[PDB]
Amino acid sequence: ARDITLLECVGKGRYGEVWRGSWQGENVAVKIFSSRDEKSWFRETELYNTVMLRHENILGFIASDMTSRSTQLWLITHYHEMGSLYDYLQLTTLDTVSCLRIVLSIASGLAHLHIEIFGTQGKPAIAHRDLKSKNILVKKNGQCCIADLGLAVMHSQSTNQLDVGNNPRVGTKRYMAPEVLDETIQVDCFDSYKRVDIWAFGLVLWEVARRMVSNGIVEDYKPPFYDVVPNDPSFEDMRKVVCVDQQRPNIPNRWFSDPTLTSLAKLMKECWYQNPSARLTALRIKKTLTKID
Numbered sequence: 319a320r321d322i323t324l325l326e327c328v329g330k331g332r333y334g335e336v337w338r339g340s341w342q343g344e345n346v347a348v349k350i351f352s353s354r355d356e357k358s359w360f361r362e363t364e365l366y367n368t369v370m371l372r373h374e375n376i377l378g379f380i381a382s383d384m385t386s387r388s389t390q391l392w393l394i395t396h397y398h399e400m401g402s403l404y405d406y407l408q409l410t411t412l413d414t415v416s417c418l419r420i421v422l423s424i425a426s427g428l429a430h431l432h433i434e435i436f437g438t439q440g441k442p443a444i445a446h447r448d449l450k451s452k453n454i455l456v457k458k459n460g461q462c463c464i465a466d467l468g469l470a471v472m473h474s475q476s477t478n479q480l481d482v483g484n485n486p487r488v489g490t491k492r493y494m495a496p497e498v499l500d501e502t503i504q505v506d507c508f509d510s511y512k513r514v515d516i517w518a519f520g521l522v523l524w525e526v527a528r529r530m531v532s533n534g535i536v537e538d539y540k541p542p543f544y545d546v547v548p549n550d551p552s553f554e555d556m557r558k559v560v561c562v563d564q565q566r567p568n569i570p571n572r573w574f575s576d577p578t579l580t581s582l583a584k585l586m587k588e589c590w591y592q593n594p595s596a597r598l599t600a601l602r603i604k605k606t607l608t609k610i611d
């Protein structure tokens with residue numbers, strides 16, 4: 319951190335800022351946490367510090383730094399110049415191959431989080447709890463990697479131990495599952511948080527698929543529920559739409575003339591069941607995406 323120069327702020331919010339920095343000439347991503355989001359900084363750090371968390375589709379950790387006297391919190395990761403999937407989707411259309419590469423890579427990263435790996439260099443099961451296109455980064459190889467583990471929760475099957483932590487920050491409201499919005503989520507059940515990830519993943523699938531061209535037709539980039547909720551929607555705005563109206567992102571008619579998008583639409587709906595138990599697992603989504611190729 320003492321040998322890094324901040325060059326440009328690639329992202330800002332009430333959470334903090336992410337900066338492009340140079341570390342010995344190599345570009346790095348620098349997330350500067352507000353003192354209010356100190357819990358998120360530690361959760362991400364301890365996962366990267368202790369857990370064997372390394373995968374092609376998880377944002378690569380480099381270093382974490384903190385000085386409190388007031389308090390500055392730094393998380394330094396690899397820098398992906400193409401930006402978030404959210405940014406990338408506004409600027410490019412896709413074909414079948416690149417669309418599948420994107421969503422299969424996300425599914426591969428989510429499966430690796432959710433799967434408990436026993437052993438020495440193993441890992442507990444991890445649920446993300448804030449999955450969204452802005453938290454997924456596009457690499458130059460055309461694959462994606464998941465970022466921002468600040469809300470993540472861990473589970474070990476052996477001890478049946480669930481580390482959820484107390485974080486004042488809740489997930490992004492636009493992506494909250496119905497059981498979160500109606501507050502019926504089993505808060506001490508690890509399976510509940512995985513199923514929350516699957517819901518958000520279904521929404522990201524919809525965001526990507528709209529940008530896949532079929533028969534000369536493509537939709538514009540839109541966030542989930544763009545047509546029914548305002549920008550920066552409230553908890554109550556989301557709950558009315560998802561739980562009362564029971565709305566879900568609409569499937570454009572042109573998708574049903576393309577076999578890939580028809581299969582993706584089927585996948586989406588199997589992430590969007592009101593019943594969290596009915597939703598597919600991450601590993602099953604990855605296998606289905608693989609068969610689509």
Ligand SMILES: COc1cc(-c2cncc(-c3ccc(N4CCN(C(C)C)CC4)cc3)c2C)cc(F)c1C(N)=O
Nearest residue numbers: 328336347348349393395397398401402405453465466
């Ligand atoms: C440090 O930690 C994190 C780092 C990142 C992260 C990693 N590599 C690249 C970026 C990045 C994202 C977007 C853009 N764009 C520039 C151009 N565009 C404008 C012209 C409109 C849009 C924005 C550039 C770089 C980021 C943010 C992500 C994280 F989620 C974390 C986390 N929360 O841990």
